[PDB]
Paper text:
We investigated a [name] from choanoflagellates that integrates two seemingly incompatible functions into a single peptide: a channel module activated by ADP-ribose with high open probability and an enzyme module ([name]-H domain) consuming ADP-ribose at a remarkably slow rate. Using time-resolved cryogenic-electron microscopy, we captured a complete series of structural snapshots of gating and catalytic cycles, revealing the coupling mechanism between channel gating and enzymatic activity. The slow kinetics of the [name]-H enzyme module confers a self-regulatory mechanism: ADPR binding triggers [name]-H tetramerization, promoting channel opening, while subsequent hydrolysis reduces local ADPR, inducing channel closure. The structures of srTRPM2 exhibit a characteristic [name] architecture, from top to bottom, a transmembrane domain (TMD) layer containing the ion-conducting pore, a signal transduction layer consisting of MHR3/4 domain and the C-terminal rib helix, and an ADPR-sensing layer consisting of the N-terminal MHR1/2 domain and the C-terminal [name]-H domain.
The tetramerization of the [name]-H domain through the buckle helix remodels the interface between the enzymatic module and the channel module. This raises the question of whether the [name]-H enzyme module plays a direct role in channel gating of srTRPM2 on ADPR binding. To this end, we generated a truncated construct by removing [name]-H, srTRPM2–Δ[name]-H. Despite reduced protein expression level at the plasma membrane, the truncation construct still responded to ADPR and Ca2+, generating currents with similar characteristics to the WT. In agreement with the functional data, the overall structure of srTRPM2–Δ[name]-H closely resembles the channel module of srTRPM2, but with some minor conformational changes that may have contributed to the subtle differences in gating kinetics. Our result indicates that the [name]-H domain is dispensable for the channel activation of srTRPM2, which is consistent with the nvTRPM2 chanzyme, but plays a role in the regulation of the channel activity. Supporting this idea, both the channel module and enzyme module can be expressed and purified separately, and each is functional.
Author numbering:
A (entry chain B): 892 to 1053
B (entry chain A): 487 to 532, 546 to 756, 787 to 1134
C (entry chain B): 649 to 729
The structure:
Amino acid sequence: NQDSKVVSKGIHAFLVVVLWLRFMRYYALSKNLGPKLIMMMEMMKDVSTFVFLLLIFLIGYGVAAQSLLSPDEDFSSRTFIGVLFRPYFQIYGELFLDDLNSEANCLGDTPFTECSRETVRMVPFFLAVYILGSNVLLVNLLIAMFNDTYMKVQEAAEDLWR
Amino acid sequence: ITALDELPSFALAIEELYKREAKKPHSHVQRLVSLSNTDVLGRHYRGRDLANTRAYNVLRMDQIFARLVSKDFSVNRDFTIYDSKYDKVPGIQFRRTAQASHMLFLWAICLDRFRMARHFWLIGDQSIINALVASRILERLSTHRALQGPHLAEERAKMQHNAKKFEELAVGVLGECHGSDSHMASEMLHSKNDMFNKKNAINIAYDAKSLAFLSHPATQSVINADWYGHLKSVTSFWAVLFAFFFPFFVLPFINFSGAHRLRRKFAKFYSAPYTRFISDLLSHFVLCVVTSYFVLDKLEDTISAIEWILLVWFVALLLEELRQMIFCDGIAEYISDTWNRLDLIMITLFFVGFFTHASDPSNQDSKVVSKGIHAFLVVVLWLRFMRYYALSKNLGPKLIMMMEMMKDVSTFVFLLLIFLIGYGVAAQSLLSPDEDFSSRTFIGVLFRPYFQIYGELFLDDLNSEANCLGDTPFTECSRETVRMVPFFLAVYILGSNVLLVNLLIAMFNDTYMKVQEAAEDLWRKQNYELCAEYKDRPFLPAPFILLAHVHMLFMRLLRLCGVHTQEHEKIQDDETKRKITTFEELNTDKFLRRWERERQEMLEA
Amino acid sequence: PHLAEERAKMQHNAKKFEELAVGVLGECHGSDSHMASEMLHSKNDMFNKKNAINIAYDAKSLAFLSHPATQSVINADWYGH
Ligand SMILES: CC(C)CCC[C@@H](C)[C@H]1CC[C@H]2[C@@H]3CC=C4C[C@@H](O)CC[C@]4(C)[C@H]3CC[C@]12C
Ligand SMILES: CC(C)CCC[C@@H](C)[C@H]1CC[C@H]2[C@@H]3CC=C4C[C@@H](O)CC[C@]4(C)[C@H]3CC[C@]12C
Ligand SMILES: CC(C)CCC[C@@H](C)[C@H]1CC[C@H]2[C@@H]3CC=C4C[C@@H](O)CC[C@]4(C)[C@H]3CC[C@]12C
Ligand SMILES: CC(C)CCC[C@@H](C)[C@H]1CC[C@H]2[C@@H]3CC=C4C[C@@H](O)CC[C@]4(C)[C@H]3CC[C@]12C
Ligand SMILES: CC(C)CCC[C@@H](C)[C@H]1CC[C@H]2[C@@H]3CC=C4C[C@@H](O)CC[C@]4(C)[C@H]3CC[C@]12C
Ligand SMILES: CC(C)CCC[C@@H](C)[C@H]1CC[C@H]2[C@@H]3CC=C4C[C@@H](O)CC[C@]4(C)[C@H]3CC[C@]12C
């Protein structure tokens, strides 16, 4: 069965990711890599604090944005993928905008104008306050948290490397 | 008046020392009395021979000191042990020396003599509470308008120095209690002193605003013992969630603090502030999930039952908000909170969107206005879910550091608005020379420049707008001046993405390295404020809470009409209070011996 | 509570022995590195023939294991000596 080969490669992609991630366990013998691993394992609590801060902004803007661009739509799985998909990749940089202008059905030469729904041109404003809350507030709070975290536990990560 | 008739001869001696200290020129106590605006009974209603001769009576001084600690602070003095009929009672002479040492102690702060206040603090009882009250009233009395004037200059200053001395002294007696026994210190700090209207000492620290006392780990051990119902079994978040999800399968199997003993253990479990906090967190999570499933799904032509469930849910939330506003604290206390204003604007956003839905249920445009009104309720309700993160240790100082860092965020917005409005007006005027003004030119100013900071440098769309037909991306254009939009775009992304954002980075690094420890001490003050807020919470969660307000209406049936209200309080043992007082005296003598040895062991001495 | 200060100050005395142990290693690193490497590979017969760096790891002394003379002994225990 070719479908069983597709299930076998989709099961083995986890084995690829976990085996190449388990190749990082031989880096503890190096002098310049081992305290960076112990400092990353100390810094993962600040990573989890950043995930717990960003999940508020992502779930709120995703439910409000996917409800606002589709007023007249029944609930399905694809609305939940439309909540959880696009907002993320708008933090990391791809501000999908043409695709939002195509989804919004706005026919103006200006990129949010001459739309059908009059309330549909507020997706930018929520997108504007979302990228100010994500790409100018929380990520740079990580930067300040990583600087205070590394200047805290650099020598303790060195003694744990010994 | 019978209040002066019940005052003994030592109260007239302290009033004679107040009249003797007030007869000196440039005295701060006569300016304190002349700016008090109070009566001779101590009420602040603003007879003249009683207001001239007996104006320095000790009940009026104690009411001025209870006003000078806080707005809701009060003291209680009993002179009825000073009668001769109670001379055969055991310990009435010891309580007489304790009450006289407390009155001469409060006079010794009131004359700002430090060593006499140390002597009346050492011979007095309840030393930690009196040191906290002293340090608060001397730190507030140094910064007061009755002590304004140059001739009371250094008594403004150095007594404030002496105020910090009592703060350091109070911490060390707690450290001496943490030197001796943690369980006896937890029995110490849950003890309600009867002279201060039966208030525990951590509430005296919060009303006295001592952030150095509240950041101590022994006080945090007392506050985390005041979390979890004082039960030493379920302390994790997931263990309390598994105990709340399965109550019958966990609570007989859990450790203790018959059927009545298991019912008392379950009543001790559900009167915990952590259990009411995780019930309010679960009710707010079910609220945000069910309003997410409401706003993502399409509204029908009639009213749905989920809209009636949201109406009953936010009607119980509005009844709990009006019960917290009107009958609990006051309007000015409830308006000072940030999260109460966020709760009021999500009540107003739900009622505006529900009135926009229920004005015309058959119009699809009214459903579009109702979903566009309810998107604010989605954003503000999920943003109000961040207010339950203050109980976590690793999240609360990140919230106080973000609230400190928002001024640097607003400085970055005030720096970037110059570059964005200048490049937006110059760029939209330069790509469209021959165009009349409309709304779309203003959207073309305010739209594209922003998203060119965050990364999408729209460029093809600018090459399509510029009508340049070259194979090179800005060449063979119609207007010869139209190929300078790159150059303005180049100096704009150097001014935005290489100057101002990295100035934020340097501002956040200096901001976090400034106020990290102050955000930690503010998290300790918000930890006792959240524990005192959820200790006085109703035991039901939020859609049951209006029904629990109906149980408060049953308290209205105990109030005036039936008037059958029966209440009681637990009375502590006299042997346990004598053991706590002997523990306080032994820890205070051990700390003053160790602090005299540490002061003699310094290099300068 | 009555064994309070003997809880505390003996812990202070515990840190005194930790500082004392580092300095005898520093005195060995004051004298000869090869004699210190012959010292720290020696198995003491009263402690079930265990070398002293395994006594440091079972004793969890992170101040002793962060010394450069112990790291010279550990890098001599790397590469087969
Ligand atoms: C300041 C905020 C937080 C308070 C609440 C404001 C909300 C409820 C108001 C303010 C401005 C309003 C919009 C103004 C104009 C229009 C055009 C109309 O054809 C459809 C509704 C729509 C799109 C309104 C929707 C609701 C709206 C967004
Ligand atoms: C919430 C705080 C930060 C400010 C509130 C700003 C909101 C309420 C304002 C700011 C700009 C406004 C928009 C500006 C212009 C238009 C186009 C019009 O055809 C319909 C309304 C609409 C889409 C407005 C909706 C409400 C709006 C989004
Ligand atoms: C310094 C920072 C805050 C710049 C300010 C950004 C704000 C004011 C800008 C950025 C993007 C803009 C939006 C872009 C597009 C549209 C659609 C249009 O049909 C109505 C106006 C509206 C909704 C704009 C309102 C103002 C807006 C939200
Ligand atoms: C150095 C700066 C700050 C001083 C002022 C320089 C300005 C006014 C000058 C310098 C170079 C000039 C450009 C040079 C050549 C052309 C091509 C011509 O077919 C149309 C005008 C145009 C596009 C000029 C516009 C004005 C211009 C931009
Ligand atoms: C202001 C300071 C920083 C430097 C000034 C640089 C300005 C004046 C210069 C630098 C590069 C120049 C451009 C270079 C080439 C062309 C193409 C030509 O067909 C028309 C003029 C035009 C579009 C120039 C306009 C003026 C210009 C933008
Ligand atoms: C290290 C940094 C400063 C690199 C320097 C960037 C400058 C010199 C570059 C970046 C992009 C460039 C522009 C890109 C496109 C055009 C359109 C063309 O018709 C005339 C030249 C002009 C206007 C260029 C002038 C020079 C320019 C502004």
